[PDB]
Design a protein around this ligand. Structure first.
Ligand SMILES: NC(=O)CC[C@H](NC[C@@H](O)[C@@H](O)[C@H](O)[C@H](O)CO)C(=O)O
Ligand SMILES: [Ca+2]
Ligand SMILES: [Ca+2]
Length: 325
């Protein structure tokens, strides 16, 4: 009888549960069960099997087009949110944004001190910065990182990846780096643990996971330079067993009154513009936020239109880079 909600575990899932799920479910007087997953294809497997157990799934904005095309997502009720309260394009007919985050470069201060990599060109430069690299085992942010390393200006990432030539060169760049990649991390918590144990010299991972590891004593530093500004959000699984209750739950948790608490401990940025007026975050708090003006200036936004067209190519080609060893 519980609504089943799933995200990717660790500090991020804990932040959503504390700020959004527990207070929203209390207000609606409903019960819910949590689950965890890393790949949107796991939601597809539930749909393909004919046994859907998940109701709400937290996915990345760039997985939304391929999930919707594969018939994995329920169409949401018309006025689930007022689109004017959220960033443009962050709310689709099948997805409601809950946050902005960054896929960024972090480095081990024991290895490099303050003179760590401060750009993707630096991250890919094994001669100037020798050491163990860690990259995600999924391609969003990883293909673009290679395009940036090749010298592509931040505002031209997706123009470069719009051609076959550019897409192949980006994979060739990742192939070149692959022998220096000690671990292809799978979850944010695993990435945070690699950082806390100093098991890697540099890593491309999510800002909240990095800041959480540093708060826990990791001797790492990071930059927003060349980071990808992402958007996470919620969708309802096609054939969700508690579809109607899940719709009410998603509408409630998207409210400004809950969104304001999302970054209380975890370094994330709420997507609901009204949450900023309620919480009145200090400039120190804003500095860790992916969407703060000073951080946006050195980032580029993920392009869901690119991922709508090339996700299948990207998944297979990147699988081969990591399988090359
Ligand atoms: N929004 C945030 O502050 C969290 C950022 C980050 N979330 C990564 C997600 O895009 C990712 O796990 C996707 O949900 C997943 O691949 C399926 O779409 C994290 O798990 O630390
Ligand atoms: Ca994502
Ligand atoms: Ca974590």
């Amino acid at each position: 009888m519980d609504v089943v909600i799933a995200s990717s575990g660790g500090g991020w899932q804990e932040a959503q549960d504390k700020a959004l799920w527990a207070p929203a479910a209390k207000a609606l007087n409903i019960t819910y069960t949590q689950d965890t997953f890393q790949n949107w294809a796991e939601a597809r497997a539930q749909v393909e099997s004919g046994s859907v157990t998940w109701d709400i799934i937290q996915i990345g904005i760039a997985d939304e087009p391929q999930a919707k095309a594969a018939g994995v997502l329920e169409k949401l009720d018309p006025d689930i949110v007022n689109k004017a309260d959220f960033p443009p394009g962050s709310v689709t007919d099948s997805f409601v944004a809950n946050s902005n985050y960054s896929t960024l470069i972090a480095w081990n201060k024991k290895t490099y001190g303050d003179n760590g990599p401060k750009s993707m060109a630096d991250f890919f430069d094994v001669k100037k910065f020798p050491g163990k690299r860690a990259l995600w085992n999924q391609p969003i942010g990883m293909i673009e990182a290679a395009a940036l390393a090749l010298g592509t200006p931040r505002d031209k990432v997706y123009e470069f990846l719009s051609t076959e030539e550019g897409r192949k060169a980006a994979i060739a760049k990742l192939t070149e780096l692959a022998p220096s990649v000690s671990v292809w991390w799978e979850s944010g918590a695993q990435a945070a643990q690699l950082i806390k144990d100093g098991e890697v010299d540099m890593i491309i991972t999510w800002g909240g996971r990095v800041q959480g590891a540093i708060n826990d004593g990791a001797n790492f530093a990071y930059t927003f330079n060349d980071a990808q500004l992402g958007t996470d959000g919620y969708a309802i699984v096609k054939g969700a067993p508690h579809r109607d209750a899940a719709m009410r739950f998603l509408k409630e948790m998207s409210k400004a009154e809950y969104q304001k608490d999302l970054p209380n401990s975890f370094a994330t940025a709420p997507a609901n513009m009204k949450a900023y007026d309620l919480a009145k975050y200090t400039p120190e708090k804003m500095a860790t936020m992916a969407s703060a003006p000073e951080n946006v200036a050195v980032q580029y936004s993920v392009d869901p239109n690119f991922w709508a067209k090339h996700a299948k190519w990207a998944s297979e080609a990147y699988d081969n880079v990591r399988l090359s060893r």
